[PDB]
Design a protein around this motif. Structure first.
Motif, PDB file in Angstrom:
ATOM      1  N   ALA A   1      -1.553  54.871 -32.942  1.00 35.95           N
ATOM      2  CA  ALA A   1      -2.090  54.469 -34.014  1.00 35.95           C
ATOM      3  C   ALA A   1      -2.802  53.193 -33.875  1.00 35.95           C
ATOM      4  O   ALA A   1      -2.840  52.541 -32.849  1.00 35.95           O
ATOM      5  CB  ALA A   1      -0.817  54.122 -35.057  1.00 35.95           C
ATOM      6  N   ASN A   2      -3.542  52.669 -35.008  1.00 37.30           N
ATOM      7  CA  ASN A   2      -3.919  51.557 -35.097  1.00 37.30           C
ATOM      8  C   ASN A   2      -3.354  50.734 -36.169  1.00 37.30           C
ATOM      9  O   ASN A   2      -2.380  51.556 -36.808  1.00 37.30           O
ATOM     10  CB  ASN A   2      -5.702  51.482 -35.561  1.00 37.30           C
ATOM     11  CG  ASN A   2      -6.010  52.207 -36.668  1.00 37.30           C
ATOM     12  OD1 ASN A   2      -5.519  52.156 -37.815  1.00 37.30           O
ATOM     13  ND2 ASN A   2      -6.869  53.375 -36.501  1.00 37.30           N
ATOM     14  N   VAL A   3      -3.548  49.500 -36.181  1.00 40.44           N
ATOM     15  CA  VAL A   3      -2.718  48.471 -37.197  1.00 40.44           C
ATOM     16  C   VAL A   3      -2.894  48.782 -38.562  1.00 40.44           C
ATOM     17  O   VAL A   3      -1.810  48.443 -39.191  1.00 40.44           O
ATOM     18  CB  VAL A   3      -2.870  47.089 -36.923  1.00 40.44           C
ATOM     19  CG1 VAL A   3      -2.279  46.602 -35.416  1.00 40.44           C
ATOM     20  CG2 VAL A   3      -4.278  46.675 -37.099  1.00 40.44           C
TER      21      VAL A   3
ATOM     22  N   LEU B   1       0.251  56.386 -24.892  1.00 42.06           N
ATOM     23  CA  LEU B   1      -0.520  55.616 -25.558  1.00 42.06           C
ATOM     24  C   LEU B   1      -1.648  54.852 -24.933  1.00 42.06           C
ATOM     25  O   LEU B   1      -1.570  54.271 -23.867  1.00 42.06           O
ATOM     26  CB  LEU B   1       0.769  54.400 -25.978  1.00 42.06           C
ATOM     27  CG  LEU B   1       1.823  55.233 -26.712  1.00 42.06           C
ATOM     28  CD1 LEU B   1       3.000  54.164 -26.815  1.00 42.06           C
ATOM     29  CD2 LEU B   1       1.603  55.667 -27.958  1.00 42.06           C
ATOM     30  N   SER B   2      -2.839  54.581 -25.750  1.00 39.67           N
ATOM     31  CA  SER B   2      -3.771  53.758 -25.436  1.00 39.67           C
ATOM     32  C   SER B   2      -4.775  54.286 -24.435  1.00 39.67           C
ATOM     33  O   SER B   2      -5.687  53.756 -24.088  1.00 39.67           O
ATOM     34  CB  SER B   2      -3.348  52.238 -24.929  1.00 39.67           C
ATOM     35  OG  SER B   2      -2.749  51.210 -26.224  1.00 39.67           O
ATOM     36  N   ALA B   3      -4.234  55.414 -23.922  1.00 38.14           N
ATOM     37  CA  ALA B   3      -5.116  56.093 -22.790  1.00 38.14           C
ATOM     38  C   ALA B   3      -6.322  56.745 -23.092  1.00 38.14           C
ATOM     39  O   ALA B   3      -6.895  57.380 -22.307  1.00 38.14           O
ATOM     40  CB  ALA B   3      -3.999  57.068 -22.090  1.00 38.14           C
ATOM     41  N   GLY B   4      -6.598  57.031 -24.329  1.00 39.46           N
ATOM     42  CA  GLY B   4      -7.823  57.624 -24.737  1.00 39.46           C
ATOM     43  C   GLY B   4      -8.690  56.570 -25.453  1.00 39.46           C
ATOM     44  O   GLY B   4      -9.759  55.779 -24.775  1.00 39.46           O
ATOM     45  N   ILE B   5      -8.800  56.634 -26.616  1.00 40.49           N
ATOM     46  CA  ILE B   5      -9.848  55.701 -27.330  1.00 40.49           C
ATOM     47  C   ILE B   5      -9.713  54.189 -27.065  1.00 40.49           C
ATOM     48  O   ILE B   5     -10.708  53.521 -27.190  1.00 40.49           O
ATOM     49  CB  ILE B   5      -9.590  56.210 -28.994  1.00 40.49           C
ATOM     50  CG1 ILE B   5     -10.494  57.407 -29.260  1.00 40.49           C
ATOM     51  CG2 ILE B   5     -10.408  55.062 -29.850  1.00 40.49           C
ATOM     52  CD1 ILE B   5     -10.013  58.065 -30.579  1.00 40.49           C
ATOM     53  N   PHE B   6      -8.375  53.866 -26.897  1.00 38.52           N
ATOM     54  CA  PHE B   6      -8.151  52.469 -26.742  1.00 38.52           C
ATOM     55  C   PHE B   6      -8.367  52.177 -25.305  1.00 38.52           C
ATOM     56  O   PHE B   6      -8.378  50.821 -25.106  1.00 38.52           O
ATOM     57  CB  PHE B   6      -6.632  52.179 -27.298  1.00 38.52           C
ATOM     58  CG  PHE B   6      -6.592  52.068 -28.616  1.00 38.52           C
ATOM     59  CD1 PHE B   6      -7.546  51.959 -29.538  1.00 38.52           C
ATOM     60  CD2 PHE B   6      -5.059  51.982 -29.148  1.00 38.52           C
ATOM     61  CE1 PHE B   6      -7.159  51.641 -30.947  1.00 38.52           C
ATOM     62  CE2 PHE B   6      -4.838  51.779 -30.462  1.00 38.52           C
ATOM     63  CZ  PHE B   6      -6.076  51.682 -31.239  1.00 38.52           C
ATOM     64  N   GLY B   7      -8.604  52.923 -24.445  1.00 41.32           N
ATOM     65  CA  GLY B   7      -9.340  52.574 -23.088  1.00 41.32           C
ATOM     66  C   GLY B   7      -8.436  52.103 -22.072  1.00 41.32           C
ATOM     67  O   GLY B   7      -9.105  51.792 -20.948  1.00 41.32           O
TER      68      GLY B   7
ATOM     69  N   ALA C   1      -0.140  70.525 -22.756  1.00 43.77           N
ATOM     70  CA  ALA C   1       0.073  70.894 -23.846  1.00 43.77           C
ATOM     71  C   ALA C   1      -0.463  70.070 -25.053  1.00 43.77           C
ATOM     72  O   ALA C   1      -0.768  68.896 -24.746  1.00 43.77           O
ATOM     73  CB  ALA C   1       1.533  71.358 -24.326  1.00 43.77           C
ATOM     74  N   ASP C   2      -0.975  70.534 -26.043  1.00 45.98           N
ATOM     75  CA  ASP C   2      -1.321  70.003 -27.319  1.00 45.98           C
ATOM     76  C   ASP C   2      -0.307  69.395 -27.997  1.00 45.98           C
ATOM     77  O   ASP C   2       0.706  70.290 -28.382  1.00 45.98           O
ATOM     78  CB  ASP C   2      -2.413  70.838 -27.847  1.00 45.98           C
ATOM     79  CG  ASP C   2      -2.943  70.391 -29.469  1.00 45.98           C
ATOM     80  OD1 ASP C   2      -2.565  69.179 -29.652  1.00 45.98           O
ATOM     81  OD2 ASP C   2      -3.187  71.075 -30.056  1.00 45.98           O
ATOM     82  N   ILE C   3      -0.130  68.358 -28.388  1.00 45.24           N
ATOM     83  CA  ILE C   3       0.788  67.519 -29.197  1.00 45.24           C
ATOM     84  C   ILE C   3       1.201  68.214 -30.412  1.00 45.24           C
ATOM     85  O   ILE C   3       2.466  68.384 -30.831  1.00 45.24           O
ATOM     86  CB  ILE C   3       0.672  66.250 -29.151  1.00 45.24           C
ATOM     87  CG1 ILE C   3       1.868  65.489 -29.462  1.00 45.24           C
ATOM     88  CG2 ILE C   3      -0.222  65.714 -30.254  1.00 45.24           C
ATOM     89  CD1 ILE C   3       2.120  64.066 -29.653  1.00 45.24           C
TER      90      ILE C   3
ATOM     91  N   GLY D   1      -8.696  61.397 -31.828  1.00 46.97           N
ATOM     92  CA  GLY D   1      -7.754  62.017 -30.759  1.00 46.97           C
ATOM     93  C   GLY D   1      -6.428  62.302 -31.498  1.00 46.97           C
ATOM     94  O   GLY D   1      -6.288  63.242 -32.175  1.00 46.97           O
ATOM     95  N   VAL D   2      -5.369  61.789 -31.145  1.00 45.77           N
ATOM     96  CA  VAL D   2      -4.024  62.195 -31.507  1.00 45.77           C
ATOM     97  C   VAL D   2      -3.845  61.945 -32.967  1.00 45.77           C
ATOM     98  O   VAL D   2      -3.285  62.829 -33.627  1.00 45.77           O
ATOM     99  CB  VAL D   2      -3.029  61.664 -30.642  1.00 45.77           C
ATOM    100  CG1 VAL D   2      -1.613  62.184 -31.314  1.00 45.77           C
ATOM    101  CG2 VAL D   2      -3.371  61.758 -29.058  1.00 45.77           C
ATOM    102  N   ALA D   3      -4.397  60.763 -33.545  1.00 47.26           N
ATOM    103  CA  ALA D   3      -4.127  60.440 -34.704  1.00 47.26           C
ATOM    104  C   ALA D   3      -4.856  61.340 -35.954  1.00 47.26           C
ATOM    105  O   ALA D   3      -4.387  61.743 -36.711  1.00 47.26           O
ATOM    106  CB  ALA D   3      -4.592  58.912 -34.917  1.00 47.26           C
TER     107      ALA D   3
END
Ligand SMILES: Nc1ncnc2c1ncn2[C@@H]1O[C@H](COP(=O)(O)OP(=O)(O)OC[C@H]2NC[C@H](O)[C@@H]2O)[C@@H](O)[C@H]1O
Ligand SMILES: Nc1ncnc2c1ncn2[C@@H]1O[C@H](COP(=O)(O)OP(=O)(O)OC[C@H]2NC[C@H](O)[C@@H]2O)[C@@H](O)[C@H]1O
Ligand code: NA
Ligand code: NA
Length: 172
Positions: A37-39, A125-131, A19-21, A46-48
């Protein structure tokens, strides 16, 4: 409300759904939605981007105000802000950006923040843009989080791959 339906039970406390979050948050009205998120809480894609777009950019203004007062987060860290129209609270969590060479072990530190909340709607977490490898992100989640976590995986193919990987991890 926390009225989750249609999830697959992976363990005693981790759930997953294709599902879409944002659509899940709109249906369930949870106490806590997790942002990946990023810092500096600069909500890009993506999700953000999805969560911020659903708040009509309110999430970004609030984040900008938070960062100005408090400074950036640390990798593996979190902060609780408003969930706006999507949830009571939003837990912004920073997974390691492995694409920027940050330490994949900080994914453990990142998921630990979930343990301050009775129930959460969350992405991987981290599984998309953060690789990070999505399968690895699921494993750390399952091994680290002891509270109730409902994982939203919007891509049906990734979802099917994740479940098959999980069964392999559990029996081996
Ligand atoms: N009904 C509906 N309406 C609106 N949006 C929806 C809907 N159903 C799903 N979505 C979500 O809107 C999102 C549009 O795609 P997007 O925001 O571009 O997500 P990404 O494809 O960028 O995911 C980020 C990362 N995944 C792996 C890649 O490395 C990307 O960096 C996507 O997650 C969809 O699941
Ligand atoms: N709308 C939606 N619903 C569910 N799952 C999603 C969605 N969009 C992406 N995803 C999946 O969630 C996972 C997390 O990827 P992402 O949202 O890119 O988070 P990261 O931790 O990898 O990257 C964080 C960074 N993205 C923009 C932020 O501002 C951060 O800098 C990955 O499997 C995505 O395909
Ligand atoms: Na793998
Ligand atoms: Na598939």
């Amino acid at each position: 409300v926390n009225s989750f339906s249609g999830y697959l039970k992976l363990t005693d406390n981790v759930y997953i759904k294709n599902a879409d979050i944002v659509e899940e948050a709109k249906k369930v009205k949870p106490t806590v939605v997790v942002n990946a998120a990023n810092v500096y809480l600069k909500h890009g894609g993506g999700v953000a981007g999805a969560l911020n777009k659903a708040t009509n950019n309110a999430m970004q203004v609030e984040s900008d105000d938070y960062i100005a007062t408090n400074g950036p987060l640390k990798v593996g860290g979190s902060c609780v802000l408003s969930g706006h129209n999507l949830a009571k609270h939003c837990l912004h969590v920073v997974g390691p950006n492995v694409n920027k060479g940050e330490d994949i072990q900080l994914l453990k530190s990142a998921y630990e923040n979930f343990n301050q909340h009775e129930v959460l709607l969350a992405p991987l977490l981290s599984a998309g843009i953060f690789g990070a490898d999505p399968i690895h992100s699921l494993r750390v989640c399952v091994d680290t989080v002891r509270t109730n976590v409902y994982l939203a995986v919007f891509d049906k193919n990734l979802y099917d791959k994740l479940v098959s990987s999980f069964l392999e991890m559990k029996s081996e």
